[PDB]
Design a protein around this nucleic acid. Structure first.
Lengths: 56, 209, 120, 114, 122
RNA sequence: AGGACCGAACCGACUAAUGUCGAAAAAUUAGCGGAUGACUUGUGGCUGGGGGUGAAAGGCCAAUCAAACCGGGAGAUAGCU
RNA sequence: ACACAGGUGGUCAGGUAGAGAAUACCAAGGCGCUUGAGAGAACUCGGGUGAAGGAACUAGGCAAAAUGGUGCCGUAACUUC
RNA sequence: AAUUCCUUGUCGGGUAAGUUCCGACCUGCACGAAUGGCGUAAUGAUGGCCAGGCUGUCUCCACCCGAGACUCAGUGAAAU
RNA sequence: CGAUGUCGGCUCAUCACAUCCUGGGGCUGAAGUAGGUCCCAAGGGUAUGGCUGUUCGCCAUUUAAAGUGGUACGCGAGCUGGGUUUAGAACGUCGUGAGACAGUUCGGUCCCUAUCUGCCGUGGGCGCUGGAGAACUGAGGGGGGCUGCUCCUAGUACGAGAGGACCGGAGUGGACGCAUCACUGGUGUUCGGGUUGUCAUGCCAAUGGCACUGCCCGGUAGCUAAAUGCGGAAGAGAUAAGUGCUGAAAGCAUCUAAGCACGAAACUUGCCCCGAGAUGAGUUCUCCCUGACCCUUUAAGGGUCCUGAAGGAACGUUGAAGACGACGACGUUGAUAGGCCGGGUGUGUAAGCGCAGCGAUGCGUUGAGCUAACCGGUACUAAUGAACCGUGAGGCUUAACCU
C-alpha cells in the first residue's frame, strides 16, 4: 500500500498535464461606467446592465 | 417493417369490462415525416430517416436546417433511423402515422432508461449481501474478492465491478399493443416501458413472433 | 439518487436547514438587503416569498401563521403594513437576485438578495 | 396530466356515493364461477380511502367467521356492483389502520349523526 | 406469502393447533408459498383426542396468508392470520373435514374440490 | 445489623463497534459490575537490584522486568553475518 | 514532544416536573469546538424506519430489538429455613 | 465426567432429523476420600444446552437524517 | 527462515471433461414404464437445514439435478478467528523434579490513505490533411442461452392384466436476468394532526424552541422491493456420435476412396447493448468562407494590414442529467428554473367568535384551515447587448472525362 519504484519527472507532469487552469477569457464591460467586471456579476463600483444597484 | 418515434407520457390502467386491470402505457405518436430515404445504389443499403415534433426558430442551425430544407418539412427535434423491409416504399417528406400499427399485435419498444447513478455492486449486479453485525468490520456492502490468487495474476476483463448504472438504451420485447387510437395520436401498449414521462422512445414491430 | 426531489441540503442538519432560514428571512425585512453566498440566497427566496402572500392577504389569522413561522414580532409588524400593500399589486416574485463576487477567504460566491424596492 | 387524464375520464364512472373513513358500507362485487355471472357482497367497516381519481380504492374490514378479513376494491373498476352505507361513524383519523388491533367492543366506532 | 419456519395455524379440526413450515414444495429453490401452494409441515400442538399429535411430517395446502392474495383487478385480500389445511402425505384428500375461517377463490382446480364443499364462505 | 438489595458520584474494566501513519507510544461513544466497604482517595514517609513488593500472573519497581536504569571494566566475546 | 476527545484532589451547588445531585429545559454566569463554501452518488462511520416471516443467520441470539415505574392483588420445585 | 483411544460408544427424552445436551449401563485406554470424594439452594460482568418474548442478525434488503468520501480555494504530511 | 500468513465459513467467481441434470445416438437379458454401461457434448443450471471447528461424514425433507476436479488442497493489502499454533488455568497421564502430549475443557489485538500492472467505468489533448454539422453503415467485441407440471392427441400403441407412451400442440409455475411505478406495499428527521415534561414571546388563549424526528399515528413526488409486464426462441448454415442411399477398390458382399442427405442445448447466424482512435481512422445528405502585399534557402513558407464565417465554447437559470466534467433543454424572435394563480393530493372540523356547561371541553360557521417536491396556465424578479476561440475556396503525384 505504498509505491514500489520512484515515479520519474516524465510520469509526474503527465498527471499534471491536465492540471492547467483556464482564467476568464470574456470580461464584459459596463453600459454606463465602462469598467471591467465579471459577466453576470456587478462592478467594483456597483453597476449591472446600466443600473446602479449596490446602493453605495 | 419500419418503426416510429414519439415521447412516452407515463403509465395508467386500462379497464376491461370483465374485471382485468391491464397496467397500460401511453405513447404519443405524432406525424412521423420521412426526411431522407437511403438506398443501395448510393449507400449500400436502404433505410429511412424520420423526423418528428416541433422545434423553435432560433435554435436549429444552418447545417441542420439545410437537410430539413431539402424536403419542405418542418423543424423536428431529431433524426432517427428505421430500416425498410425491402418491400415497403416511401418518399421524402411523406408523413407516416400511428395507423401504421393497426394490425400489429406485438411491438418491440426500445429506449433509454433512467440514470440510476454510480451504483454499488449490491445494487448493480445483485451480489448477495454478507453479514453486518456478527463481529464483521468494514466490509458491510462492498463486493469482496475480485479474482483468484497468484496464478491468474490479473483480473479477467468484464468482472462486474460497479458502473454508472442506467441511461444506456434498453430494449424490451413482445409488448402486447393494447389500443391503437388515431385521433388523439396516442398509442397504448401493454406492460412496463423504459423511459421517463417525456423521454425519447423507439417503438418498432416485433421480429420475435 | 436525486430525481426531481426539491431542496438544498447545504451541509447542515434538518433543524439547522429551516431554523437558519428562520433567521435570514427574519433578517431580510429589516434593512432589506444582505450579503451572503449564492446557494443560500437562492434558497432564501422560496421561504421569504410565502411570508409575502400571507402579507398581502391580511387578517388576524395569517398574521399568526407568519408568527408560527419566522418568529419576530417586529418583522411581522414590518410585514402586512410596510411591505404588504407595497407588493399587494402584481403576481408574485418579490425578490431580486444579482450576484456579487467572491469572498476574501474561500471563494464562496456571494450574492445579493434584495426586495424589489428601495426607490429612495 | 391533460393528455393522459383525458383517457382517464372516459371509463371513470359518474356517480359513486361519498363515504368517509369510519363508515360501514356494503360493497357488492362481481364474480364468475364457470358460466354463472353472479353477485357477492361484503359487510364491513371502511377504514381507509386513497384518492387518485381513476386510481382510487378503499379498505373495508369485516369480521368473518373467526377472523377479520380486510379487503380493498379499486373504485372505478367493473368488478364492483353497488355501494351503500349502513351506518356512519364519527372517526377522527383519516386512515384507521389501528382497527386491526382492537376486537369486539373497542372496534365499534360510534354513530356520526352530524 | 409465507416461507419456512413459520408457526402457522391450521384452519380445520384435525388436531393441529400450531404447525411449522419447513420445505416448500414445487420448486427447485422456490422460497415462497401462497394462494394454492403446497407446503410440508409437522404439528407442534394437538388436542388430546385428535387424529394427530406432535411430531408427524405432513403435507398441507395454504389458503390464508397474512400478506394476501393478488386478485387480477388489483384487489388485495388481507386476513389477520395464516392458515393451511392438513392433508395426507400422498393421497391428499384431506384429513379434517370441518374448517374454521373462510378461504379465497384461488384454489379451484380439480384436486382440492373438497375445499369448496367444506368452505364456510367464498 | 449487614464485605444485604437496586442504583448516581466516585471505582473499575466484562461485551460490541470506531481507532489501530489513532484526537491518544491500548482510549472514545452506547451497554456491563462493587457502590457502608477483603472499599476509594489527597498530601507526607519506608522497601533498592539475587534485592523488594506481591489476595501469585513471573505480574510490577518512572510509558522497558524470567532480573531495573546511568556510568565503568571494555574496542567483552564473537568458529557467525 | 503539541493551543492534545486522555488524568488531578477539597468548596459553592438556583427554579419547576422527579424518591434523587441522574435525567428533561431554562435564571444567573460562560461558550459555539481556529479551515470554511458547495455537491447531494458508490462508500465506510453515528443512526430513525419497515411488507409476510421469526434465529431459517451464526462458532455462538455477540449485535440490534425487546422489558422497564411507584402502589394493591398474587407467586413454586428446593431449602442452610 | 472439566477425568475417555476405538468414539458421533450403546440405549431413553428432547428435534421432523441432534458429534452439542439431560437421566443412566459399567468394560474406568488411564476416577477416587484433605497433589480431597459425592450431593448442595442461594451466587457468578462463569462453561454447554433450552423453549417463550423479541427484533433487518438472516431469507433478499430498500429509502431516509446527518460527519467525512467528491468539487472550488487556503495550509499541507506519511511509510516508501 | 534481513517473512511466503496456515485448516475452515462467507462474498466473488472462473477454467477443464473423466457429464450429475437437459439435448442427440448405439446396444440390451431393449415387450411397455424404468433402468444399466459405452460413446458425442462444457451452452446453461448446479439445495435449505438438524449436527459438527467444518471441508469429511449421517439421517431428514426437497430436486429435472443437488457432478467432479484445477486455480498457494482458489480468493486476509476483502471480512469472521470457531479449528491448532503464545503466555493465564484445570483434569488425566508420564517424570523425583523443572515441566511435555494426533489427549480433551475454558479465556485469548487480524493493521496498511492504491504509486504501477489489472478491471467496471469515465472525462481532457489531439489525430483522421479546409472547417463545422447532425445522422449512420458495419469490421470487430460482449451479453443472453435454465427447467419441471397438467391437459389433448389416446386410457390409445406394447402387454393376459396391473399398468402405460415417443416427435407433436396448449396453458400455468420454479430460478436467474431486463426494465417499470399504474395498482399492492415500504420510505417520506421538509408534512398535517396528537401529545408528555419544560422554556420563552408581559399573562390567559394561541403558537414556536429542547428532549435518540422528543415520542407518536398516517402520508405526495420521487427511490425502490415482496408489487407486474417482458426475457431465454421459432427459423437458417456447416459439423459431431451416429443413420445413410448408390456403389468401388477386392466382378459379389461394404455408411466412402469420387460423390449426394438429414443430424445436438455445443461451432458461426437469429434476437439484444457497446462499436470507424475499424490509424485499413471509411460512406451519406450537406451548411460556411473566392482582399490586399515585400521577401525567398521560392521552402506544402514565414510576414504585416484588414478581418475574424457556419459553428464550438465561455458565462447564465437549470435538467427523471448527474461524483467534477461529459450528455440533454432553454437563453427575452422567452415557459429554463424559484414564484403566483387554477387544481390534484395529503392530513382531516384553522383561528376567532357564538352558545351549551361549575369545568375539563362539546356542537354551529366547518369536510374548514393548511400543504414539500407533482399536474395545467402567466414574465413577477432572475437567464446583459458584447468580447473570446476557430478562418480568408482548402499538398502533391496519376490516368480515366472535360478547356
Amino acid at each position: 500500500a505504498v509505491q514500489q519504484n520512484k515515479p520519474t519527472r516524465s510520469k509526474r507532469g503527465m498527471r499534471r498535464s491536465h492540471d492547467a487552469l483556464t482564467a476568464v477569457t470574456s470580461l464584459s464591460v459596463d453600459k454606463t461606467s465602462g469598467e471591467k467586471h465579471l459577466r453576470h456579476h456587478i462592478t467594483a463600483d456597483g453597476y449591472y446592465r446600466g443600473r446602479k444597484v449596490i446602493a453605495k | 417493417m419500419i418503426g416510429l418515434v414519439g415521447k412516452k407520457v407515463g403509465m395508467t390502467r386500462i379497464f376491461t369490462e370483465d374485471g382485468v386491470s391491464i397496467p397500460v402505457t401511453v405513447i404519443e405518436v405524432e406525424a412521423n415525416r420521412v426526411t431522407q430515404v437511403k438506398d443501395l445504389a448510393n449507400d449500400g443499403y436502404r433505410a429511412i430517416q424520420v423526423t418528428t415534433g416541433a422545434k423553435k426558430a432560433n435554435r436549429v442551425t444552418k447545417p441542420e436546417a439545410g437537410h430539413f430544407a431539402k424536403a419542405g418539412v418542418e423543424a423536428g427535434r431529431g433524426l432517427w433511423e428505421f430500416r425498410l423491409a425491402e418491400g415497403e416504399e416511401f418518399t421524402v417528406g411523406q408523413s407516416i402515422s400511428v395507423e401504421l400499427f393497426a394490425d400489429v399485435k406485438k411491438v418491440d419498444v426500445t429506449g433509454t432508461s433512467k440514470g440510476k447513478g454510480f451504483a454499488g455492486t449490491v445494487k448493480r449486479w445483485n451480489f448477495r449481501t454478507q453479514d453486518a453485525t456478527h463481529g464483521n468490520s468494514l466490509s458491510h456492502r462492498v463486493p469482496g474478492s475480485i479474482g483468484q490468487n497468484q496464478t491468474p495474476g490479473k483480473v479477467f476483463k468484464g468482472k462486474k465491478m460497479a458502473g454508472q448504472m442506467g441511461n444506456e438504451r434498453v430494449t424490451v420485447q413482445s409488448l402486447d399493443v393494447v389500443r391503437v387510437d388515431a385521433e388523439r395520436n396516442l398509442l397504448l401498449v401493454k406492460g412496463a416501458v423504459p423511459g421517463a414521462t417525456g423521454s425519447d422512445l423507439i417503438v418498432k414491430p416485433a421480429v420475435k413472433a | 439518487m436525486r430525481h426531481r426531489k426539491s431542496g438544498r441540503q447545504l451541509n447542515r442538519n434538518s433543524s439547522h436547514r429551516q431554523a437558519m432560514f428562520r433567521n435570514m428571512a427574519g433578517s431580510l425585512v429589516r434593512h432589506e438587503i444582505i450579503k451572503t453566498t449564492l446557494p443560500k440566497a437562492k434558497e432564501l427566496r422560496r421561504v421569504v416569498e410565502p411570508l409575502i402572500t400571507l402579507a398581502k392577504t391580511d387578517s388576524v389569522a395569517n398574521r399568526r401563521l407568519a408568527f408560527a413561522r419566522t418568529r419576530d414580532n417586529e418583522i411581522v409588524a414590518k410585514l402586512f403594513n410596510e411591505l404588504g400593500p407595497r407588493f399587494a399589486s402584481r403576481a408574485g416574485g418579490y425578490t431580486r437576485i444579482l450576484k456579487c463576487g467572491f469572498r476574501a477567504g474561500d471563494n464562496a460566491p456571494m450574492a445579493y438578495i434584495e426586495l424589489v424596492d428601495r426607490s429612495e | 396530466s391533460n393528455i393522459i387524464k383525458q383517457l382517464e375520464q372516459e371509463q371513470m364512472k359518474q356517480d359513486v356515493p361519498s363515504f368517509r373513513p369510519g363508515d360501514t358500507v356494503e360493497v357488492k362485487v362481481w364474480v364468475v364461477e364457470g358460466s354463472k355471472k353472479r353477485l357477492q357482497a361484503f359487510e364491513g367497516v371502511v377504514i381507509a380511502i386513497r384518492n387518485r381519481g381513476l386510481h382510487s380504492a378503499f379498505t373495508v374490514r369485516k369480521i368473518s367467521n373467526g377472523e377479520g378479513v380486510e379487503r380493498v376494491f379499486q373504485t372505478h373498476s367493473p368488478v364492483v356492483d353497488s355501494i351503500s352505507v349502513k351506518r356512519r361513524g364519527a372517526v377522527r383519523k383519516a386512515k384507521l389502520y389501528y382497527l386491526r388491533e382492537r376486537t369486539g367492543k373497542a372496534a365499534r366506532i360510534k354513530e356520526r349523526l352530524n | 406469502m409465507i416461507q419456512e419456519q413459520t408457526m402457522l395455524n391450521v384452519a380445520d379440526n384435525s388436531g393441529a393447533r400450531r404447525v411449522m413450515c419447513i420445505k416448500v414444495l414445487g420448486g427447485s429453490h422456490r422460497r415462497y408459498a401462497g394462494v394454492g401452494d403446497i407446503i410440508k409441515i409437522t404439528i407442534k400442538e394437538a388436542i388430546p383426542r385428535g387424529k394427530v399429535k406432535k411430531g408427524d411430517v405432513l403435507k398441507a395446502v395454504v389458503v390464508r396468508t397474512k400478506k394476501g392474495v393478488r386478485r387480477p383487478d388489483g384487489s388485495v385480500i388481507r386476513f389477520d392470520g395464516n392458515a393451511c389445511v392438513l392433508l395426507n402425505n400422498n393421497s391428499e384428500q384431506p384429513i379434517g373435514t370441518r374448517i374454521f375461517g373462510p378461504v379465497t377463490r384461488e384454489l379451484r382446480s380439480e384436486k382440492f374440490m373438497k375445499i369448496i364443499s367444506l368452505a364456510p364462505e367464498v
